[PDB]
RNA sequence: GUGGAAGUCUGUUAGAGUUGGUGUCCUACAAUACCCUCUCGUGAUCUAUGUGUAGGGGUGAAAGGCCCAUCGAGUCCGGCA
RNA sequence: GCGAAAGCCAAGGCCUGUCGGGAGCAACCAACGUUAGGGAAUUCGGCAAGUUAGUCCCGUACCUUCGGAAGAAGGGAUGCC
RNA sequence: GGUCUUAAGGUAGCGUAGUACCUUGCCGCAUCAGUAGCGGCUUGCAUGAAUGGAUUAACCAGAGCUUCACUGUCCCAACGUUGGGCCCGGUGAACUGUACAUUCCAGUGCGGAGUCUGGAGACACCCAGGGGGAAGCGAAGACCCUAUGGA
RNA sequence: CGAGUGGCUUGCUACCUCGAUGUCGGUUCCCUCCAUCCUGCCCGUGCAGAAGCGGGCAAGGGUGAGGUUGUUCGCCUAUUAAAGGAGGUCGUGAGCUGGGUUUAGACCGUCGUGAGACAGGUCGGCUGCUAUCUACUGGGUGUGUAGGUGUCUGACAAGAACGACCGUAUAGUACGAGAGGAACUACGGUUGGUGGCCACUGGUGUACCGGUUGUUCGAGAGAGCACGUGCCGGGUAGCCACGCCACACGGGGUAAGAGCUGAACGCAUCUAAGCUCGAAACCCACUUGGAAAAGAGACACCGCCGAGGUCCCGCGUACAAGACGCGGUCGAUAGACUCGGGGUGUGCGCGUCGAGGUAACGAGACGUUAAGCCCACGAGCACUAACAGACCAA
RNA sequence: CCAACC
């Protein structure tokens, strides 16, 4: 699977899914991409990103 | 109860307001006991997905609200664990009002279920929209 | 009415001291059944990863299925059964009556005790044969020890030295047994002890924390809302009613926690390689890195990293063994993240 | 719109005071202290110095409050062993 | 900046609110920071802590001695160039 | 009762009250559940008119109750910060002390014993700790009674 | 109606204490009792079943959360297997609380000519102490047993280390007209308790990196101060729980009870002798401590001119002193350096752009730049420091 | 309940 936020990876057995409102779901990678996408960034905009490379 | 499928860190006491996933005229249900739970001195009774819960409705309509139901916990905002490790979590708490059979007393469901739940309560999944 | 409650703390794991023994000791061994064999071996803690693994148990919903577990890395080198000891039964107990010793000696063996220069392995199995045609011959163990050096993460040299018991068929043929491992050279292997699958009990001594106060050691509760402001947060009520006048030993109090012996049982063998599959990238913290004979444990193990553990086949197990897990995984994530 | 009243409001301005923490201290820094919070702050306001009222007497928006760590009758010595 | 407010800084003063050295420095205590989910269930009692907050625009109920209630409430805005 | 004591015999109002013993009075509201609180009823053990009654906008570090918001008050505790605590140099008190004293379980005893009796346990010394006991220390009990005491 | 046991209530007494043994309720923490609420095993039934009702053994474990009230008790609500009662100075203020009670202020009702009174009501109202002994939790130094290293034994000691529930199959079966509706057994899970661990999730993380407000260092760069981070965002190690792991079966002897053989008493009789069974309870199993067990232990090897040990040195798997553990060139023990693995989020400088503006100037954007900065981890590497050296010892 | 006088 890859982190729907940062384009990495996600390790097996790791990560967590946010099931939203709607019913969409996000899968992150990690609390850093949860946070960021909490902060209101969009992962295109954040350099370190893979999504961005 | 059967095996839910995923370990849970139950996100809900006794005395919490959490939304009715339904369309039963019941718009906050207010937790205020666990079935088959029994805690430890000073604990506060806790709850979590795919417990049932009986309830007492504080917000919706004049014929609805106070009155004492039983329920099922559909959605917490509180991580569980699935068998391969990942961790599920919802944007919200919710429940849905059920009979004593276990069948909703609504007609429909609102908002994503979890898989989980519907193993439990075929029912209650029988009736839900978006299973996650 | 003052509701009931568990006390704070088991009363079984004590008292709560700092351990004699860092090498841990069992207190007990499996019954004889199968062939003869060495009931026991060791290894020294590295870390934990998880590792992907197929459902094995044939009374689950999910057999077959993708399954995440946690798992414990212990660096099982081959150690040395280097002598060969015998109990005799008398109206006080099992007390040591020989050992058989070898010739062969690990380089540094030096580094613990007086190796013998000048034994007679005749003499003494000799007595011990004897002893059994009397029909007083206790169990049969092998003085046993590892091979620190084997391990490059582990700065220890010094060789471990412990006892384990020597149980199988019938005692004349475990004692040939015995003989045989010993007069070799004593080498043996995890894996001429257990098998992946298989349930083992594994003891160490934990991790040591030094003193601690009652609600870390014991569980107790801190005080609570006005209570925790007039002085007193983290002391218990009271040390006991006014009669008896005096303070039991079951009340909760401060001291020693951490650095005691445990023996955690059932704990399943995943997997036992030698290599450096299960290693982490950077390394595993405040250890290394691993590429040897290893050990995955299901779980948690007692101890620090580095420490030595012991295992022996589980002596009460729940379930029935369900030999060599499939491994679909095995994390090698950077452990720092 | 002007005007700028008020035992008027906000205000750690100066200054005065002290609701709660039943916090800290409680052989104290201190025989009444410390911290935060809190109240008043153009007036029956606060404050310095000078001056007056004296013990069954003063003084008291009254609590038996205060009259030099002392008050339901000060302090000192005497009556007095 | 509204300011004799906070905070920072001059002139000027000081290192004397006068015992030091050492241990990643444990338990425990005094002050205090951060805590997932739940959100007063705690307690005699929301005690303690917190929430709100400056300024401008919109808007503001019952009641009233017509003064007031009122900053009611509620809503929006706020930098830099 | 349909006057009598002792002059009159409680009017307007308010009322289970900061006054009601009975009492968690009864009805309702609110809560899952409310000896609370608010409204109403009210025969008021024992309300009531300047011993002021009622009422009331505004005011209040005054008493009680409810809601929204918020939160480590709580579930259930964790990690961290500063000063102590601990070790070292120097300085250097006080409280308290009939004697003995390593105690524990029972009993006995002026009936609430480390010291008496019977047993049990107990190698000496030292460090840190939270305070079970010494009916701990501190104050010739502020209560109660007694005194041909005081004010 | 008669006979008792307890010492939870109340009363009675005045034996102890007035040169003081702090008073209710609650809280926290520990031990206990059984007259048993649940759980185990039984007997009876107005016992079909399911379930009730009553009785017996039994104290291993459990007995919880909430609304009024200071309340105890109690009333009430939803859960529960059940939400039992009682003793420990009505256990527990040199532990907490201070609501009640319980001074000095004040009010109401009633009483009193009055001062003033009222387990009547009401608002406010003060809790000291650096532990000597003893007790216990943990940590040391000595002596005894009587040169050293390593390994054990197990007298004793502690444990609840495990208790309970739900679900599925059995089975819509047995039973019953139907309604209703089991069990043995095999399984999956939950809960309470217990011990440990950090790969995962979560918290912290005044290491670190970034953003940014006021002010000062002329600007820039780079910084100080704003409480021991100014504020905000992210977060490594470590520590943690909200995370993860593990915590039987089986034996032996019994109680109540079901029986066998069996006589006194030819019969009968579970009992008098004998015996087969039978509880979550007892013992064992399992875990933890344990040579100071004075019968003060056992084995193996080393050594008595030398085994081993101490000081010393580099350090932590250890740690408040002490203790413990590892390494010391026969070496990777710590540091430097370089890699690797991590955190943050794209550096200074310069170039282009940039709303405008005559121009000066210009917030900011892009590129250089997966940049810069940083790391309590790992590897490599003897570069630096584990050197030199002193001493005890049958 | 109760923590004194009633
Ligand atoms: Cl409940
Ligand atoms: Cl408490
Ligand atoms: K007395
Ligand atoms: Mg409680
Ligand atoms: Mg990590
Ligand atoms: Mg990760
Ligand atoms: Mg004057
Ligand atoms: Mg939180
Ligand atoms: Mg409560
Ligand atoms: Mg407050
Ligand atoms: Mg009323
Ligand atoms: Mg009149
Ligand atoms: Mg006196
Ligand atoms: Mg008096
Ligand atoms: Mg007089
Ligand atoms: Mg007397
Ligand atoms: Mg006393
Ligand atoms: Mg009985
Ligand atoms: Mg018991
Ligand atoms: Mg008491
Ligand atoms: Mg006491
Ligand atoms: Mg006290
Ligand atoms: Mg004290
Ligand atoms: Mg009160
Ligand atoms: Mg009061
Ligand atoms: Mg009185
Ligand atoms: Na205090
Ligand atoms: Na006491
Ligand atoms: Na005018
Ligand atoms: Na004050
Ligand atoms: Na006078
Ligand atoms: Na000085
Ligand atoms: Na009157
Ligand atoms: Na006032
Ligand atoms: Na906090
Ligand atoms: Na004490
Ligand atoms: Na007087
Ligand atoms: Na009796
Ligand atoms: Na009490
Ligand atoms: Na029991
Ligand atoms: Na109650
Ligand atoms: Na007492
Ligand atoms: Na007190
Ligand atoms: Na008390
Ligand atoms: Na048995
Ligand atoms: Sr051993
Ligand atoms: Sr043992
Ligand atoms: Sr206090
Ligand atoms: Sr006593
Ligand atoms: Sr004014
Ligand atoms: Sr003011
Ligand atoms: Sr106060
Ligand atoms: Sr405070
Ligand atoms: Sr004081
Ligand atoms: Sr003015
Ligand atoms: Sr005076
Ligand atoms: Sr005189
Ligand atoms: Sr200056
Ligand atoms: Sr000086
Ligand atoms: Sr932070
Ligand atoms: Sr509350
Ligand atoms: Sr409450
Ligand atoms: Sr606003
Ligand atoms: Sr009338
Ligand atoms: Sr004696
Ligand atoms: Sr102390
Ligand atoms: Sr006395
Ligand atoms: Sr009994
Ligand atoms: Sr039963
Ligand atoms: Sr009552
Ligand atoms: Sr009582
Ligand atoms: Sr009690
Ligand atoms: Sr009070
Ligand atoms: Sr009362
Ligand atoms: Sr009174
Ligand atoms: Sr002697
Ligand atoms: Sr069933
Ligand atoms: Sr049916
Ligand atoms: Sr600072
Ligand atoms: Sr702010
Ligand atoms: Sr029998
Ligand atoms: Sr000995």
Same mark, same amino acid.
């Not at chain 2, 006991?33 to 506060?44: A, D, E, I, Q, W």
């Not at chain 2, 979590?89 to 007393?105: C, G, L, T």
């Not at chain 2, 193993?119 to 029988?126: D, E, I």
């Not at chain 3, 148990?57 to 280097?82: D, K, L």
């Given at each position: 699977?890859?982190?729907?936020?940062?384009?990495?990876?996600?390790?097996?057995?790791?990560?967590?899914?946010?099931?939203?409102?709607?019913?969409?779901?996000?899968?992150?990678?990690?609390?850093?991409?949860?946070?960021?996408?909490?902060?209101? *960034?969009?992962?295109?905009?954040?350099?370190?990103?893979?999504?961005? *490379? | 109860?059967?095996?839910?499928?995923?370990?849970?860190?139950?996100?809900?006491?006794?005395?919490?307001?959490?939304?009715? &996933?339904?369309?039963?005229? &019941?718009?906050?249900?207010?937790?205020? +006991? #666990?079935?088959?739970?029994?805690?430890?001195?000073?604990?506060?009774?806790?709850?979590?997905?795919?417990?049932?819960?009986? #309830?007492?409705?504080?917000?919706?309509?004049?014929?609805?609200?106070?009155? #004492?139901?039983?329920? #099922?916990?559909?959605?917490?905002?509180?991580?569980?664990?699935?068998?391969?490790?990942?961790?599920?979590?919802?944007?919200?708490?919710?429940?849905?009002?059920?009979?004593?059979?276990?069948?909703?007393?609504?007609?429909?469901?609102?908002?994503?279920?979890?898989?989980?739940?519907?193993?439990?309560?075929? +029912?209650?999944?029988? &009736?839900?929209?978006?299973?996650? | 009415?003052?509701?009931?409650?568990?006390?704070?703390?088991?009363?079984?794991?004590?008292?709560?001291?700092?351990?004699?023994?860092?090498?841990?000791?069992?207190?007990?061994?499996?019954?004889?059944?199968?062939?003869?064999?060495?009931?026991?071996? =060791?290894?020294?803690?590295?870390? /934990?990863?998880?590792?992907?693994?197929?459902?094995?148990?044939?009374?689950?919903?999910?057999?077959?299925?993708?399954?995440?577990?946690?798992?414990?890395?212990?660096?099982?080198?081959? /150690?040395?059964?280097?002598?060969?000891?015998?109990?005799?039964?008398?109206?006080?107990?099992?007390?040591?009556?020989?050992?058989?010793?070898?010739?062969?000696?690990?380089?540094?063996?030096?580094?613990?005790?007086?190796?013998?220069?000048?034994?007679?392995?005749?003499? =003494?199995?000799?007595?011990?044969?004897?002893?059994?045609?009397?029909?007083?011959?206790?169990?049969?163990?092998?003085?046993?020890?590892?091979?620190?050096? =084997?391990?490059?993460?582990?700065?220890?040299?010094?060789?471990?030295? /412990?006892?384990?018991?020597?149980?199988?068929?019938?005692?004349?043929?475990?004692?040939?047994?015995?003989?045989?491992?010993?007069?070799?050279?004593?080498?043996?292997? /995890?894996?001429?002890?257990?098998?992946?699958?298989?349930?083992?009990?594994?003891?160490?001594?934990?991790?040591?924390?030094?003193?601690?106060?009652?609600?870390?050691?014991?569980?107790?509760?801190?005080?609570?809302?006005?209570?925790?402001?007039?002085?007193?947060?983290?002391?218990?009520?009271?040390?006991?009613?006014?009669?008896?006048?005096? @303070?039991?030993?079951?009340?909760?109090?401060?001291?020693?926690?951490?650095?005691?012996?445990?023996?955690?049982?059932?704990?399943?063998?995943?997997?036992?390689?030698?290599?450096?599959?299960?290693?982490?990238?950077?390394?595993?913290?405040?250890?290394?890195?691993?590429?040897?004979?290893?050990?995955?444990?299901?779980?948690?193990?007692?101890?620090?990293?580095?420490?030595? @553990?012991?295992?022996?086949? =589980?002596?009460?197990?729940?379930?029935?063994?369900?030999?060599?897990?499939?491994?679909?995984?095995?994390?090698?994530?950077?452990?720092?993240?």
């Amino acid at each position: 699977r890859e982190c729907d936020y940062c384009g990495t990876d996600i390790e097996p057995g790791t990560g967590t899914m946010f099931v939203h409102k709607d019913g969409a779901t996000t899968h992150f990678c990690s609390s850093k991409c949860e946070n960021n996408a909490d902060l209101g *960034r969009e992962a295109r905009n954040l350099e370190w990103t893979d999504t961005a *490379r | 109860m059967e095996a839910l499928g995923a370990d849970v860190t139950q996100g809900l006491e006794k005395g919490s307001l959490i939304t009715c &996933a339904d369309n039963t005229g &019941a718009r906050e249900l207010k937790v205020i +006991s #666990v079935h088959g739970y029994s805690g430890t001195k000073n604990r506060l009774p806790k709850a979590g997905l795919g417990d049932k819960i009986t #309830v007492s409705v504080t917000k919706g309509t004049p014929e609805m609200r106070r009155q #004492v139901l039983e329920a #099922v916990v559909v959605r917490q905002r509180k991580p569980i664990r699935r068998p391969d490790g990942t961790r599920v979590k919802f944007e919200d708490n919710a429940a849905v009002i059920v009979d004593e059979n276990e069948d909703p007393r609504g007609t429909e469901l609102k908002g994503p279920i979890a898989r989980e739940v519907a193993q439990r309560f075929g +029912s209650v999944a029988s &009736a839900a929209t978006m299973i996650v | 009415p003052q509701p009931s409650r568990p006390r704070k703390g088991s009363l079984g794991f004590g008292p709560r001291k700092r351990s004699t023994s860092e090498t841990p000791r069992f207190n007990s061994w499996p019954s004889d059944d199968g062939q003869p064999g060495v009931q026991g071996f =060791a290894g020294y803690k590295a870390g /934990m990863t998880h590792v992907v693994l197929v459902n094995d148990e044939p009374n689950s919903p999910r057999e077959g299925m993708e399954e995440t577990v946690p798992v414990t890395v212990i660096e099982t080198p081959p /150690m040395r059964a280097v002598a060969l000891r015998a109990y005799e039964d008398t109206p006080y107990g099992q007390r040591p009556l020989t050992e058989v010793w070898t010739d062969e000696f690990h380089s540094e063996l030096d580094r613990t005790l007086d190796v013998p220069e000048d034994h007679d392995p005749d003499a =003494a199995e000799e007595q011990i044969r004897d002893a059994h045609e009397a029909g007083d011959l206790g169990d049969l163990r092998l003085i046993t020890h590892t091979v620190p050096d =084997a391990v490059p993460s582990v700065p220890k040299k010094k060789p471990d030295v /412990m006892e384990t018991r020597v149980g199988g068929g019938s005692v004349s043929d475990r004692l040939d047994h015995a003989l045989d491992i010993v007069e070799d050279g004593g080498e043996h292997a /995890m894996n001429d002890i257990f098998r992946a699958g298989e349930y083992a009990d594994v003891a160490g001594v934990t991790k040591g924390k030094g003193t601690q106060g009652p609600v870390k050691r014991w569980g107790v509760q801190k005080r609570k809302g006005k209570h925790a402001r007039q002085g007193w947060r983290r002391r218990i009520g009271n040390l006991g009613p006014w009669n008896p006048s005096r @303070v039991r030993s079951t009340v909760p109090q401060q001291g020693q926690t951490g650095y005691h012996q445990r023996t955690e049982l059932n704990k399943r063998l995943i997997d036992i390689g030698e290599g450096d599959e299960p290693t982490v990238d950077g390394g595993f913290v405040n250890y290394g890195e691993v590429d040897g004979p290893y050990t995955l444990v299901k779980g948690s193990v007692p101890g620090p990293d580095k420490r030595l @553990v012991r295992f022996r086949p =589980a002596v009460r197990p729940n379930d029935q063994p369900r030999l060599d897990p499939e491994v679909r995984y095995v994390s090698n994530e950077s452990n720092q993240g």
